[PDB]
Amino acid sequence: SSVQTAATSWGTVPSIRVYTANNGKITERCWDGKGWYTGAFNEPGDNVSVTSWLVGSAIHIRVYASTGTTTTEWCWDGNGWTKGAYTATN
């Protein structure tokens, strides 16, 4: 019924990313210290989770988008979103 969210953050500002699964689609809202805005992530999914990590000054984000029993990993590594290698046999 209600939307389903996942959130991650990094640094001291901080930067925050909030992913919302709604009606089969996952979108992204972003905060970098100035106000909330809509991010570049939009992919199919009924469920979302996220994790992120820093390597020095580089942020790496992994978003896990699921529809049915299939989970697709999406990867941010500084140069746009790319499909990750994650697989599972659910």
Give the separation between CA 37 and CA 17, rounded to whole angstroms: 10
Interaction between residue 39 and ligand BDF (CB under 6 A): yes
Q: Considering only residues 28, 45, 48, 66, which one is a binding residue for ligand BDF as defined by CB under 6 A?
A: 28
Give the separation between CA 64 and CA 23, rounded to whole angstroms: 16
Q: How far is the CB of 68 from ligand BDF (least distance, A)?
A: 20
Give the binding-site size for ligand BDF (rule: CB under 6 A).
14
Buried b (16+ CB within 10 A) or exposed e, 67-88: eeeebbebebeeeebeeeeeee
Q: Considering only residues 17, 19, 26, 48, which one is a binding residue for ligand BDF as defined by CB under 6 A?
A: 17
Asked if 48 and 63 count as a contact pair (C-beta separation under 8 A), the reply is yes
Q: How far is the CB of 43 from ligand BDF (least distance, A)?
A: 11
x/- site string to ligand BDF, residues 42 to 61, per CB under 6 A? Answer: --------------------
Number of H helices, E strands in the chain: 0, 8
Interaction between residue 66 and ligand BDF (CB under 6 A): no
